[PDB]
Coordinates of C-alpha atoms in Angstrom, one line a residue:
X129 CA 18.6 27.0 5.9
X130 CA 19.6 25.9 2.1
X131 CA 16.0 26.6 1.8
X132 CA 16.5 29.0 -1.3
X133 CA 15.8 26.1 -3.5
X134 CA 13.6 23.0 -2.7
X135 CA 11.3 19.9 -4.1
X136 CA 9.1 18.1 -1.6
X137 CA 8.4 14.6 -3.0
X138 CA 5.8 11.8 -1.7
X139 CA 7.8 9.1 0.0
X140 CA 4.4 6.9 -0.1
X141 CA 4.1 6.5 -4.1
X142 CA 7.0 4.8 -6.2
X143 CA 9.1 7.1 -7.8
X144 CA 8.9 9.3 -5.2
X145 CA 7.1 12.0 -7.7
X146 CA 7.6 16.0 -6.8
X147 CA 4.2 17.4 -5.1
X148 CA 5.8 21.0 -4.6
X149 CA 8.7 22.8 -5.8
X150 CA 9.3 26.1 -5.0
X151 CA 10.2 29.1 -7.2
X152 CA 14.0 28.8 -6.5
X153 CA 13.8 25.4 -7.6
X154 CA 12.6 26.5 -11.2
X155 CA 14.8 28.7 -11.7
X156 CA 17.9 27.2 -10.7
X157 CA 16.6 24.4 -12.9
X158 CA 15.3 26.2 -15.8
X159 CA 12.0 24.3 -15.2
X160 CA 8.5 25.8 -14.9
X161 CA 6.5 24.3 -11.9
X162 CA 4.7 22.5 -14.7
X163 CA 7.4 20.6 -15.8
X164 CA 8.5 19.8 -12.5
X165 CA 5.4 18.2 -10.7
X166 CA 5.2 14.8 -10.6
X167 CA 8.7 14.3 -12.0
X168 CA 10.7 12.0 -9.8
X169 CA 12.2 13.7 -6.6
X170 CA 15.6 12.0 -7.2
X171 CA 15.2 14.2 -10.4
X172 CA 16.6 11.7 -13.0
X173 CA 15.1 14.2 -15.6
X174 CA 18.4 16.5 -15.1
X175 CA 20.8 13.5 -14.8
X176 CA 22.9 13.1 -18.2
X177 CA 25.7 11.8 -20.2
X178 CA 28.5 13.6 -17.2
X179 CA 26.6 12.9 -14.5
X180 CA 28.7 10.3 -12.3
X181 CA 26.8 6.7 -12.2
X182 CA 27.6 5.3 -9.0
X183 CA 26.2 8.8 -7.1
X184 CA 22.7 7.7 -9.1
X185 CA 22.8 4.6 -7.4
X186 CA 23.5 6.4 -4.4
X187 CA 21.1 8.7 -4.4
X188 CA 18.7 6.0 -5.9
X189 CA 19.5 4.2 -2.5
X190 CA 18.8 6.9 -0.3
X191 CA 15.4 7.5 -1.1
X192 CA 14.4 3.2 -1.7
X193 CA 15.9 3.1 2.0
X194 CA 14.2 6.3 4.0
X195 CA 17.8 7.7 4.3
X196 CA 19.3 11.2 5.0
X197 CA 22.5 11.9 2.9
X198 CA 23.7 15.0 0.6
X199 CA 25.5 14.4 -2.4
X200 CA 27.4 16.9 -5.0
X201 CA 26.1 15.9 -8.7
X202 CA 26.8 17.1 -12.2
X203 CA 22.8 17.6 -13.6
X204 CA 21.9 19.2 -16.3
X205 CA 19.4 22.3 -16.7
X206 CA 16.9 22.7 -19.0
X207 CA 18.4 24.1 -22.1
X208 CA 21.3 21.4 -21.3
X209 CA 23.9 23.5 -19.2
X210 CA 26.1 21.4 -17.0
X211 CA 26.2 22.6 -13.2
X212 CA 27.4 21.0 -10.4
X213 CA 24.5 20.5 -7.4
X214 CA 24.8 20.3 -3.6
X215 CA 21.8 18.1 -3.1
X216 CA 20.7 17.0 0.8
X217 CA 17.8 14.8 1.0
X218 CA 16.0 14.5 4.3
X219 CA 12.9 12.1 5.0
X220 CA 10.0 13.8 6.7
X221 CA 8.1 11.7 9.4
X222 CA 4.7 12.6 10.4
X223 CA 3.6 12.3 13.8
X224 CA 3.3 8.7 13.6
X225 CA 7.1 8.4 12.8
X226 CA 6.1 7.2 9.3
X227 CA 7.8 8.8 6.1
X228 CA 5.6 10.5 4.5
X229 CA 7.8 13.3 2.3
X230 CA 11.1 13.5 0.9
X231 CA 12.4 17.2 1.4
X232 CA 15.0 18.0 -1.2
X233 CA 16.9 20.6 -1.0
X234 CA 20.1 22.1 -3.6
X235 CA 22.5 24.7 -4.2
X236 CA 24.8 25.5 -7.4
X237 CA 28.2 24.7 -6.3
X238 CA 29.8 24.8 -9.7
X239 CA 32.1 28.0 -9.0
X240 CA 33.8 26.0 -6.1
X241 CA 34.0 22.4 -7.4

């Protein structure tokens, strides 16, 4: 499922800001909820100084263009720990085959990078 930790973000409003992140999300992030909402989905809040600059524009490019890809990324938490993320990022349609949610989902892959 890779459900464990997740960010839905609004495909309809630029940015693409978070609208729910669950409680594995916060705490693989060291963010409270608070800090979270409303914050980009692509969540260039954790990106930093190691993080690799084309996968930005890659991710960047998957959400401008409604795509589904997954991407491994060096972020940073909260109190500035590097970790490496497995991040998939899947459109949701509604029944109108519109976009209407981003559903992001990640993993801490750091132990086997």
């Amino acid at each position: 499922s890779h459900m464990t930790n997740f960010v839905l973000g609004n495909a309809q409003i630029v940015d693409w800001p978070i609208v729910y992140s669950n409680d594995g999300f916060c705490k693989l992030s060291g963010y409270h909820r608070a800090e979270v909402m409303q914050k980009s989905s692509a969540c260039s809040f954790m990106y930093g100084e190691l993080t690799d600059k084309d996968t930005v524009e890659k991710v960047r490019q998957t959400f401008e263009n409604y795509e589904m890809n997954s991407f491994e990324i060096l972020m940073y938490k909260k109190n500035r720990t590097p970790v490496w993320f497995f991040v998939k990022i899947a459109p949701i349609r509604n029944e109108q085959d519109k976009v209407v949610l981003f559903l992001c989902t990640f993993s801490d892959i750091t132990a086997f990078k």
